[PDB]
Ligand SMILES: NC(=O)c1ccc[n+]([C@@H]2O[C@H](COP(=O)([O-])OP(=O)(O)OC[C@H]3O[C@@H](n4cnc5c(N)ncnc54)[C@H](OP(=O)(O)O)[C@@H]3O)[C@@H](O)[C@H]2O)c1
């Protein structure tokens with residue numbers, strides 16, 4: 001189960017999310033990534049931010065070297081950090097991510113966020129010049145596909161309307177779940193053959209640096225719980241399955257053996273139209289990442305409602 005991107009490459013519709021907070025040792029990323037691939041995840045999501053590209057690359061290479069998968073059955077993503085928006089900085093950051101991971105190429109490179117930062121407080125950078133630079137990475141074969149993350153609709157339109165555009169973004173990876181379902185943005189992405197990829201699809205890690213602990217816990221929601229009991233699955237599985245039936249590619253982070261295996265069960269059952277409607281009724285503009293440290297950035301994405 002893959003979707004065709006708008007540049008003719010294929011992305012598997014379920015991905016493994018690799019971020020863990022700095023309190024978790026680096027070494028854990030190697031082990032869970034292996035477990036992920038072993039349970040059947042073929043889409044692995046990382047970034048320069050995560051400080052785990054070496055372990056995620058090792059895990060991938062190890063599962064190739066033990067014969068379980070070829071390179072080409074793995075879809076590996078990484079992301080350009082926000083200090084590296086000036087265009088001359090883009091290929092070197094990708095080359096850097098490739099060497100940490102000890103791979104020849106990434107299946108996908110994303111701009112991690114539109115909120116540019118001084119290299120190395122906010123920066124002002126024409127993100128069309130960043131994008132041109134992402135295109136040259138694809139033309140060089142350093143990334144199979146290129147995309148954006150944390151763009152709102154108007155920020156997407158800016159790239160799509162660029163003079164001399166060579167490659168549209170293949171996807172926009174944004175926060176997306178039953179409390180913040182992004183359906184207007186999803187409709188716009190669909191009208192342009194851009195894949196929406198959902199992060200914090202299970203309600204996020206609730207890290208105190210960015211998430212108010214008073215916020216409702218997505219996986220305690222009573223409608224997801226009732227649906228879980230109706231289907232004899234789990235609330236995580238319902239949140240995951242909702243995204244696939246809306247045409248959304250979904251990430252799922254877990255560092256626990258049993259949850260990793262449970263999550264691939266999303267392929268084994270269906271929700272009804274009435275189920276999908278009950279879930280669409282939970283939407284309440286709740287973006288779990290909600291911090292003073294970005295909220296007044298000039299290109300804050302949630303300034304467009
Ligand atoms: N582009 C961006 O700016 C951005 C932002 C956020 C995240 N991401 C990407 O998205 C990935 C996923 O999002 P996320 O990190 O926010 O976490 P998430 O996918 O919402 O997961 C939330 C928590 O759910 C738990 N979980 C997973 N499966 C479960 C299950 N079956 N039952 C109950 N708990 C379960 C995990 O805890 P356990 O580990 O204990 O199982 C995890 O800490 C990230 O790791 C990263 O790759 C990108």
Ligand SMILES: O=C(O)[C@@H]1CCCN(S(=O)(=O)c2ccc3ccccc3c2)C1
Pocket residue numbers: 019047049112113150210289290291294
């Ligand atoms: O990609 C991930 O998993 C990271 C998790 C923790 C930090 N973030 S991040 O790039 O600093 C970040 C922080 C705050 C944000 C607020 C609104 C939207 C995106 C954000 C990304 C991404």
